[PDB]
Symmetry: C2
Subunit: 141 residues, 2 copies
């Protein structure tokens, strides 16, 4: 868990920190006007777990990673929504396809292309919505 980039977003809400997973199985992005939160399902030290960060409003959009598929990009926009500085839009790329945007509120763009390596986990801040998000990076095996 030595390489953490981000977080992008605001200073509100409460901190979360997943740490790195052995393998990410799926990510669900909950969104409506903004990004409400994320589920991450993953393997970890012999266990399989699901963790939820942020709120649970909006609609879930699930990206299931197939055998040999991994996350190689994240991008989005940081927006003001109802006075909260949050992820207004969020998306992800795998080595196969890009997904998103999830959310509808424009703001300040950010983008993280990973030319070598993969996203292995998440940290950030959450409340009613997803205030901020960053990622753990690991090399490819």
């Amino acid at each position: 868990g030595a390489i953490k980039v981000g977080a992008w977003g605001g200073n509100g809400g409460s901190a979360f920190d997943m740490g790195p997973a052995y393998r990410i199985i799926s990510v669900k992005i909950f969104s409506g006007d903004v990004v409400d939160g994320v589920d991450v399902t993953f393997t970890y030290y012999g266990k399989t777990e699901t963790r939820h960060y942020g709120g649970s409003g909006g609609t879930p959009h699930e990206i299931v990673l197939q055998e040999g598929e991994y996350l190689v990009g994240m991008a989005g926009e940081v927006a003001n929504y109802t006075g909260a500085v949050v992820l207004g839009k969020l998306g992800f790329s795998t080595n196969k396809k890009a997904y998103g945007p999830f959310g509808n509120t424009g703001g300040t763009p950010f983008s993280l292309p990973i030319a070598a390596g993969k996203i292995s986990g998440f940290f950030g801040r959450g409340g009613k919505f997803l205030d901020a998000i960053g990622v753990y990076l690991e090399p490819l095996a």
Copy 2:
């Protein structure tokens, strides 16, 4: 290769790709800029020898970052701009554990930002032509 983590590049697809790799100790960076980011010099040491590599073009005014003892690059940010029909770095700056430098350049466009919560920049890659078309970084633990 060999466990590298490379993020970026941010910028356009013109010019010629460069890739310094991560093997070297970065001593200083010089960002040449005017309206946009024209180029960069990266000076590094390796086995007691100091070398400078220049990427991008010949224009712009220099803006230097000379890393002090115990000073490491821990952020990069800027703007990707359309300038005279090319997609290039319109602004580029860096942060260390000590100080923020820049950004340098005068043309906005699409912002990017790389806060590094854990880790440091250990090398550069990107694309350079008349201007600095794009830039990315190698990361390692701190």
